[PDB]
Amino acid sequence: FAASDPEYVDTLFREQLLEVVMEGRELRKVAREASNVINANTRVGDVPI
Amino acid sequence: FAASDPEYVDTLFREQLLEVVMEGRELRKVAREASNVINANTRVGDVPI
Ligand SMILES: [Mg+2]
Ligand SMILES: [Mg+2]
């Protein structure tokens, strides 16, 4: 009509894109504190009971 | 196939045994506290009442 943003929104500037990317859902990670951790030397093995 | 651990599990290494053997259920030990204990001088004896 006059020059206005809604008309020229891709022609005379680009929309701002915020430089920070916003995180998704973050799961609770507890196994390493909540159990005994065996760093095994082999992929298969046994523990004596 | 091409050399993979699931075909040579007892051919090119042994499976790990964990050196820690792991306990069965332990029962609750209380009788020596929960009772008057007589260290007897004889196998058979009497307490007077
Ligand atoms: Mg086994
Ligand atoms: Mg008697």
Side-chain angles (χ1 to χ4, degrees):
Chain A
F1 73 100
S4 70
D5 313 343
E7 294 167 275
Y8 297 126
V9 70
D10 266 309
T11 71
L12 289 173
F13 58 98
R14 313 307 315 215
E15 290 172 40
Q16 177 168 16
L17 187 58
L18 195 79
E19 295 190 334
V20 173
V21 52
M22 287 289 163
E23 307 298 5
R25 193 176 97 242
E26 164 88 54
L27 303 180
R28 297 172 178 267
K29 301 154 185 68
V30 299
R32 306 185 83 142
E33 201 172 28
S35 67
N36 189 22
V37 174
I38 301 175
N39 292 289
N41 298 298
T42 60
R43 197 191 52 80
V44 183
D46 278 273
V47 52
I49 281 75
Chain B
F1 77 115
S4 189
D5 84 61
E7 74 212 306
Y8 303 121
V9 294
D10 261 314
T11 300
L12 289 175
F13 61 97
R14 316 309 315 218
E15 286 167 8
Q16 185 172 9
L17 248 186
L18 210 72
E19 287 185 329
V20 181
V21 54
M22 306 222 272
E23 306 303 336
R25 85 194 198 265
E26 291 195 346
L27 304 186
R28 291 171 176 271
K29 259 71 89 184
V30 296
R32 290 181 191 252
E33 299 183 338
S35 179
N36 179 50
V37 175
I38 303 78
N39 298 308
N41 298 296
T42 60
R43 196 204 108 239
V44 186
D46 290 83
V47 50
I49 286 148

